[PDB]
Every structure is written in C-alpha cells, then in structure tokens.
Amino acid sequence: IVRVFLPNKQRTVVPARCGVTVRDSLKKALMMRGLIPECCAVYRIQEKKPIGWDTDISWLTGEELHVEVLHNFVRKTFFTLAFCDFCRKLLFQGFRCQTCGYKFHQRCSRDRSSSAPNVHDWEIPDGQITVGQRIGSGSFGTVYKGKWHGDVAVKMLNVTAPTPQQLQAFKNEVGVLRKTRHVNILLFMGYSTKPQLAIVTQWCEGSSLYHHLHIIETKFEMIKLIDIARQTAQGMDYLHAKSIIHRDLKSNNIFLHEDLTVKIGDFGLATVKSRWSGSHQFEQLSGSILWMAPEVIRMQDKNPYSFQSDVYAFGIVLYELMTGQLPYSNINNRDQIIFMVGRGYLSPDLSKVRSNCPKAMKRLMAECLKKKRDERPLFPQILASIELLARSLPKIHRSASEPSLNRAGF
Amino acid sequence: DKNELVQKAKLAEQAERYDDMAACMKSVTEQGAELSNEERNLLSVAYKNVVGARRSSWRVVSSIEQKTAEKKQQMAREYREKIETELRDICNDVLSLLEKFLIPNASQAESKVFYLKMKGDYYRYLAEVADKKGIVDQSQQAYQEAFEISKKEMQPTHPIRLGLALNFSVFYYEILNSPEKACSLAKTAFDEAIAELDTLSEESYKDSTLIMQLLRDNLTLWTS
Amino acid sequence: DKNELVQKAKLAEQAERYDDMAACMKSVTEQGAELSNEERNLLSVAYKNVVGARRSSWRVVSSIEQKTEKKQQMAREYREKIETELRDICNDVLSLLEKFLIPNASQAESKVFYLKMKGDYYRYLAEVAAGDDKKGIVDQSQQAYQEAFEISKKEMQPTHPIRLGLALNFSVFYYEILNSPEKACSLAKTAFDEAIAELSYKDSTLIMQLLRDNLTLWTS
Amino acid sequence: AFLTQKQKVGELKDDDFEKISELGAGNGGVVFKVSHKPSGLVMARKLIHLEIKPAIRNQIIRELQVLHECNSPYIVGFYGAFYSDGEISICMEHMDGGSLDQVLKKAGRIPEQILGKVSIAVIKGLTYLREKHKIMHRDVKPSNILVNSRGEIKLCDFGVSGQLIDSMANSFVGTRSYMSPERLQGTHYSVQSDIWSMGLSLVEMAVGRYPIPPPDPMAIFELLDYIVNEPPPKLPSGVFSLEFQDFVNKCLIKNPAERADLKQLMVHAFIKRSDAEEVDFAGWLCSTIGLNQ
Ligand SMILES: CNS(=O)(=O)Nc1nccc(Cc2c(C)c3ccc(Oc4ncccn4)cc3oc2=O)c1F
Ligand SMILES: [Zn+2]
Ligand SMILES: [Zn+2]
C-alpha cells in the first residue's frame, strides 16, 4: 500500500507491486481527476522532491506521495488580435489547441516579418471641500463623501508633517496621475493638502467586487464573469500604458455601478506610501495579503513592484471571480498565509474552480497567478484573450461534443 | 484518381480551405470503393469543420437574435435562414453519401459503427437547427444501432464508442432534455472504461484520453 | 439601404465567414456615396482577412511548393488557383478604389488611408506577381504610399493612428518586397520617434510596439 | 476568595454609553474606555470591525457568550458584547495598567524578579483554559495581558470563536510575530504552540528587545524567515540567572519532540522557586506609572 494525495488533498491508496510503473496505476484515480500521467508531478520526500512516472513501486513501498500538476494542435489563421503565447509576439497565422485556447507559432517551438494589425495651482483648496461622514476604511486610509458642485470623495493617510521636498513631488504625482481620463476610472478632482493630506476622488453607488463576491454572493455566469474580466483589464491597460502601477488592486476597490458601469479607484500614491521616516522610499505592507505577489509580500527589493505585480493582483481578483469564494480561505491563520505566499511553498489551489469554467482560461488565470514574475503576461494581452472569448461564448454555450483529430505534424 | 484526391485534401486541410476538401473528399468516396483509415477520418475531418462552421456560425448568428423590433430583428432572420439552407444542404450531402454508398459498403465493424455514428451526428445538427420529429428520431435510431453494434467488437475504451457515448449523451440532454439518461450512459461508458484501461494502444492512447476528460466535463456540468 | 448594408456585414462580422460581407461591402459604395468612418472601417477589415485567408493559404502551400516531385506538382496548379481568386478579390477593391473611393476623398484623413490601402492591396499583388508585371505592380504602390505619406505629415497628428499604420506598412514594404532594409529601419525610427516625442489609444500603442518589434527584427 | 461578579449589567446599547477617553493605540484593535450610566462601572471598549456576512457575524456573537463560564481571577472577565454601529463591540474589564505593552514602553525594562510571578499566573491561566474548556489561547502576546495596579495580572483575547479566528485572521495584520514554527510550517500542533508564543513573549519582557533580529527593523515577512528556518533565539546571561535559562530554553525549541509538556513545566524547580520568594505589585507600578492605591 502506497498512499498518495491528490489535488484538493484527496486520498487514494494505489496498489503496491513490482515491475509496473506508477503511470497507468495512478492514472485511474488520476483520470477521475482528469489528469493525464504526462502532465502532472508527484513527490517523494526523504521539502518536496519531484519524481516522474517511470518509477517501479518496489522502491516506493510504504511512502506518502503528492499529486500536483506541472495538447491537440489544429492549424488556424487568426483574423483579429491574437498574441502568440510562447514568445508573446503578434499572431496572424498559427496553431491553436482545440480545448485549452492556447495559441503559439510553430516557428518558436527567408522567413517572414510583421505588419499592421486588423484595425477596428490646481489643488483643491480647503473650506469649499465639504468633509464627509464616517464611511469606512481599507489598506491606507478612509473615504469622505464630499459636497462641492457634485459628488466627490476625500481621503486621509499616515504621514503628518513631511519634508518640503516630499510635498513638491506630491504636486508631481497628481500631474502624472490626474491625467487618467478613461471610462473605467472615476474622475480625480484633486486633493486637499492645506488640511491633512488627501486624495480626492468621486463616489459610486452599488459596491465593489468583494461585496458582490463575499457578502451578497450574487454569483453571475460567464456572460458577466468574463465581461468583468474585460471591463477591469481595460481599466488596467490605460493605467499601464503610461506607467502608473495601481499597486492597490483589490476586489474591494473595483466599484461598479448599476452592474453595467465598472469603475476603479484608490491607486498610486508612492509618496504617501514609501514613508519618509527619514528621506527614503521605505514602503510598508499595509492591507491584505492575497492581492500581493510573492515578491511584494517578501518586499525583498527596495521597489519590488512592477506591472507584473499588478498582474498577480489580477489573478486573485479572477480566481475570486470564478469560484465565488476568496483565495486562501481555509487557513485559520495570518502569518501562515504571509510565510507561504512569500516563500513559494504554496499557491492558491485551482481545483476549487468551477466545473463549467472554460479550459481556454486555464492557461490565462494560471499565468496571472504564477510564482515567478518573468512569466505572467502584461496587461495588453489580458485584454486580448478576454475580448477573444467574451464573444466566443455563444460558440461554446453548449455541452461538449467529439472534437477533431490531431492535424499536427512535426 | 484517389491518390491525387487524397493529396488535394491533404493540401486543403493545411490551408484551412475546407470547402475545397469538402467537395474533393465527396469525390474520392463516390468512387464506389472501400475507404481505408487514412481517407476515412479526413472524410469526417472535412465535413466536421465544414458542417460545424455554419453551426458555429448559426450559434453565433442566432444568439444575436436572442440578443434582441421589426427591422433589426428581421435582419438576423433572413441571414440565419441563409445559414440554415447552407447548413441543410451540407448535412444532406453526407447523409445521401452515407445511405447510398457508405453504409452499404461498410465492411468492418468499427467502420460500420463509424458511418452510423456520423448519421446520428448529422441529423443532430438538423435537430438543433430544427415533421421536425422525424429528424430527431432518425438520429436516435442511427445512434441506437450504432451503440448496439459498438458493444460487441471493439475494446471498450475505443474512441468511437466513447465518442458516440459522448455524442449520444449530448443528444439526450440538448434536444430531448433527459439528462438522467444522458448522465448514466456517460457515467457508464466513463466508469466502464476505468476498469478496462489496461495497457492501451499508443495510437488511440492520446485520442481516447481526450474524449474521457470531456465526458467528465459533461458529467461535472450535468451534476448540477 | 445604407442601414441594411452596414447591418448585414455586422451580422457576419463576427460569424467567422468573411467572404460574405466582403461580397456586400462592394455593393456599399458601388453606388459611390459618401463614406463615414465606421462603414469605411468595415470596408477595410473585410479584404485583409479574405486576402489574409488567401495569403495564409498562399503562405503554407508555398512551403509545400518549396518542399519539393509527383506529389509536389499537385500544389502548383492548386497554388495558382488561390491567387487567381486572390488577384480577382484584390482587384475588385482596386477597381472599387480607382472608381469610387480614391477620387472621392474629402477630408485630410480620407486621402491618406485609401492610398495606403491602395498601396497595400498593390503590395498583396506584389507579394505574388512575377515577370514584367511584378515591378510594374510594385512601382504603382511606391507612389501610392508616397502620395499619402507626405500628406500625413502636414495634415494629421504625429500620434493620429493612420500615420503609424501607414508608416508601419510603408516601412515593411521596403524589406520583404523591395529587398531594401536600410531604407526601412532608418525610416521606422523617424516615425517611431516622432510620436514618442510628443506622446483612441489602444490602436495607437499596438502599432508603436510593432514599430519597435519590426525595428528589432530589421536589425537582426 | 476573589468574589468576581458581572450580574450588575443590564441591556447594552450605544446610547447607554458616554465616552471618557482612550486606553491606548493597539495593533489589531484600538482599545477605548467608556461610561455606562446604568451600570456606572468603567469598562474597556475593544472595537474591532469586520465587514463580513451578517450570518457569519451573528454566528460569532452568540459564541462570545461562552466567556461567561470561563470565569477566573486569571482571565479577564467578560461584561458583554453586542452588534451595532456596523462594528463589533467586545467590552472587557477596565484594568488600570492597560497591558504590559505600555509598561515596557514606560518602565524601559522589567526585572527577573517580576517574570517569576507572571509566569506562574499565565501557566495556570492557560491551564484553566485547556483542562476546563479544551481550547487554548492562540494569541499569547504581551499586549493581550491586561494588568492593573491592584496586584493582579491576567490574560485576554483568546480564541472564543473559530469563525472569528479566521474572519479576523485576514484583518489582524500586525508587525511582530511570536507564532510557533509548528503553526507556520503548514500544520497545527496547538498543544505546543502556545508555549513558544509565551516563551518568545517573555524574552520581550526580560530584555525588552525584540529578539527575532538577534541581539548578539526587519521586514514584516523577514521575521518569519528567522522563526521557521534557523535555530531559535536564547536569553542573555549574566543579568539573568542560569536556572532561568533552564526554563526559557525549554519553551523555545522548534521541534515539539524536545518541547516539555505543560506538566513538565510545573515539575521544574525554578517554576516552584519563583513563588518561594514574594514580590510586591501594589507599590511597584505606582512608583513608575504615577497612579495611587
Ligand atoms: C493571532 N493568532 S490566531 O490564533 O491565528 N488568531 C486569533 N487568536 C486569538 C483570538 C483572535 C480573535 C479574537 C479576539 C480579538 C477576541 C477579543 C476579545 C475577546 O474577549 C475575551 N473576553 C474574555 C477573555 C478573553 N477574550 C475574545 C476574542 O476572541 C477572538 O477569537 C484571533 F484572530
Ligand atoms: Zn511565438
Ligand atoms: Zn490543451
């Protein structure tokens, strides 16, 4: 008897024999999990040392093992925005998997080149700023609903009397960050620095995505669960075309109104953050720990952020978006989440995802949550694969059916 | 004749020029001779993308009608019918090809299973598109004797049986709306394949596995 | 009716069959009426796919045509069947362009795109054409780009999308066809730096990365 | 012999309290103090807010009433909690010494002669929690040890609700971590964790210096790297007795196999040595806090 775990911690005692490899023996319990014995990894420990599939059970008797995951290729020629996924170029013609939605060029696995695509002061003064009421809290501040010729918001924060050279950069942070005019972003009326420092925004009805996915739990279907992956990646491409890292991507900050209009706020602020306890940029871990990458939890760099650490903060608002629960919702701890997320021992379990989730996404949401940073895709592609299968949903609105043959020749 | 007509599809598949290899595989099987496995699946490969694309289109075309006056609503109606006429004719081409030449000359068991498997599948596309009860019933029969002959010859992990079981399950739910019959046979074919999944042919090793995970995706979707 | 024409394409716009709408955009302006923006956008997107579908079909079968001889000879007549459609499909627009589109340009952005559209459609013919007609077709796009490219500078913004689209198409014409990479890489940088110096936005930036992506390749 | 009673209280609602001042600024929750007109006695107002499902919130409040039967002079008594203002109001006893977080920040250091007395109270206050209620503290930190100028020291803020253990575990950020390696490595061995969480807490009292950056600040994650990768810290000698090192080093070993059971922690001589010598605690704080009687 050689006990082995499974994804979702499930248990199965496979038989112990001699001369026949783990592959087909484990495949039985594996295949009810839908795991081919060519794509997964199993571990033997003398932390977690992987072992393959050609191992006879003679040396494996009486040992506990884990089961952890580590293609039929038709051809196609892509008639809209299609970005390769092995060198992340622009794809016009090339392969595509039938079920997993992952396209790539055979070249990258006298030749041609590329071409065109298939087209389609000024600070809020004190006095008139009507300071609001008790509204709540968050990671670094508080909302105050203002009343001055319309609906606005006021914030507070944690640096009281900064050095004069700090404040002039604050006039430049807004100049970089007041230019965010978009449809996914609420307007920025300015800020009030004569009173305690603020970051003035608008106010929106409805609520955020965290309220919609942890309190009311009015879970939607993919016609809306992929629209939200659209009207939130788009608001995080304009935010990165001009290099303003959100660095605050929370399901609690995605304030959508009427369930049609999607709005995003509460971002930026590298001067209020990076506290000037002296005259440095020493940033601090204030807030939650789920929307944070391994290297933002680690803080092992002076500035460990990136546009990638805004993508590991997009999978967590996506792995929340499908299942309906929240990531790491079973560990009855605080410092255990921080240790593993920072270390690389544990990552969110993808077994708890829905049964009707499109397999084309399994190569998207897994990238937006990879342990490393040099792998997760940048935000223009996120709006690409989510426009792609936002309208390919009526094509795949049925149950399954028998697919085509290989059509792949090497 | 056949040798050139095999290549003319092996050159129109690679360039996604389907309607050429839809109208050239029809011309290599109306030769009146038997089909080896090579040109066998290409005949299915050819039509599946040809007949599927308008179904893949009519699904998209009709959905916009489900996404909606008297002028805008009308405009999809004529166009969706224009898909229907194109889809109806392509369905009948193989059905006429199946009944007149293919099925009578089906010498081998799994081949006899295969061409019958197409027949129900093809009426299924007319079933989803569309008296109307004759289409759904004849698919049920064509599946029915397809499944019945499947139980005898081939090893119980064959893609054709599971593909039929996967196919025949979908007809139960999406037209008749009887998932419990669909769930059981999908479960039965899936579960039975578990025990019989001994050492398996490398050729069908990849193809059978791809089917089985889809069956669970049907089951795991059908559990709710 | 103009409403019916624009709608009918939009029902097939996402249906993945692109020949059907390409066969109805011809009827849109065969009357010769004034073109707004969106319909003019729908006119462009059609034949790029239809040619692209043919070009992508053209590309692959050429590899078989370049693979090798009893089997290989089947490709050539099959190959020549593709362009015979492809040449006919493209020449429909060039006939349409030189009858109702180009001589009816009104605004600053009207003239620039059609000429680049005319040049690229000539380039698509220039991809395959041989013999004495090869350079004759290639030449007729040299001015087609040149006519528009000099209008782009004086009439529309450095970041207005058409110029980057034109510059990228104008630049790529020099390397693959003209066998003139030096005139290209030194030319992309001019348009590359023009927009970034004085840097509705997504279309702009993707051409920008393509400009840098092509500049890197052109330097390879 | 201590005569603890909480029957005087009646219905509890926000309009029946008038605030006086704030006890101090805590880490996870901020502690207040308020005046209740009917009861009259001063109370400790611990306001922690959780925007959670009301059913989950309601499942916890009813479980906060089990604090009534966990009565002792070793654990702070529970006046009563209720839901209002959108916030959870965990009222507690108002003890004039706050906790021993202020004490270290005011007195600068705490001598060995005091640690002997407090270690007696907690090791039995924890025993009152385990052997009776079958649950343990899970939150052994110095700022959860309420003290007063009456000569008494007591514990507070244990795990009263397994739901709010996790519902707040993603809201209790903090910056100092005393959690045991067994509670961080990925499993739970609760029987031995609270000993470490007390072993490290006392070193913060004996020396007053946070030992995770070794004596002989680090990033919030970097502390746990020390905690669960390399051998544990140890108390300085000289000013501390060598037989006191026999106590702390038996409470600060990673592997629970070498950890001594609670029963082993009363069979030691030093734990039975601390109570052999008496210490005044009425005038001790009054000579360093400015309070009287
Ligand atoms: C930090 N470690 S953890 O174990 O992971 N998490 C937690 N551990 C303990 C506790 C908590 C949360 C928590 C708090 C804040 C609390 C506060 C006052 C209280 O009332 C009271 N009354 C009388 C005597 C003692 N308390 C009971 C309480 O119960 C709780 O569960 C963790 F969130
Ligand atoms: Zn590539
Ligand atoms: Zn795949």
Numbering used by the authors:
A (entry chain A): 156 to 201, 204 to 227, 235 to 273, 360 to 370, 449 to 738
B (entry chain D): 2 to 69, 72 to 133, 137 to 230
C (entry chain C): 2 to 69, 73 to 203, 210 to 230
D (entry chain B): 52 to 267, 307 to 383
Task: Kindly provide excerpts from the paper associated with this entry.
To maximize purity and homogeneity of the MEK-bound complex, an additional protein preparation was generated from serum-depleted cells that had been treated with the MEK inhibitor CH5126766 to stabilize the BRAF–MEK interaction. Here, using serum-depleted mammalian cells, we were able to isolate two monomeric BRAF complexes of sufficient homogeneity for structural analysis using cryo-EM, resulting in a BRAF:14-3-32:MEK structure of 3.7 Å resolution and a BRAF:14-3-32 structure of 4.1 Å resolution. In these structures, the BRAF monomer exhibits an autoinhibited conformation with a 14-3-3 dimer bound to the canonical pS365 and pS729 sites and the CRD making stabilizing contacts with the C-lobe of the kinase domain and with both protomers of the 14-3-3 dimer. The BRAF kinase domain in both monomer structures displayed the canonical kinase-inactive conformation, with the αC-helix in the “out” position and the R-spine broken. For the larger monomeric BRAF complex containing MEK, the active sites of MEK and the BRAF KD are in a canonical face-to-face orientation, with the C-lobes of both kinases making extensive contacts and the activation segments running in an antiparallel manner. As expected, MEK was in the inactive conformation with its αC-helix in the “out” position and density for the MEK inhibitor CH5126766 visible within the allosteric-binding site. In addition, residues of the αA-helix of MEK, which acts in a negative regulatory manner to stabilize the inactive conformation, were resolved and lay against the base of the MEK αC-helix. The BRAF RBD in both monomeric structures sits on top of the 14-3-3 protomer bound to the C-terminal pS729 site and adjacent to the C-lobe of the KD, with N163 of the RBD being within hydrogen bond distance to S679 of the KD.
RAF kinases are essential effectors of RAS, but how RAS binding initiates the conformational changes needed for autoinhibited RAF monomers to form active dimers has remained unclear. In quiescent cells, members of the RAF kinase family localize to the cytosol as inactive monomers, maintained in an autoinhibited state through intramolecular interactions between the RAF regulatory and catalytic domains and by the binding of a 14-3-3 dimer to two phosphorylation-dependent serine sites (pS365 and pS729 in BRAF). In response to signaling events and RAS activation, RAF interacts directly with GTP-bound RAS at the plasma membrane, which ultimately disrupts the autoinhibited state and promotes RAF dimerization and kinase activation. Here, we present cryo-electron microscopy structures of full-length BRAF complexes derived from mammalian cells: autoinhibited, monomeric BRAF:14-3-32:MEK and BRAF:14-3-32 complexes, and an inhibitor-bound, dimeric BRAF2:14-3-32 complex, at 3.7, 4.1, and 3.9 Å resolution, respectively.
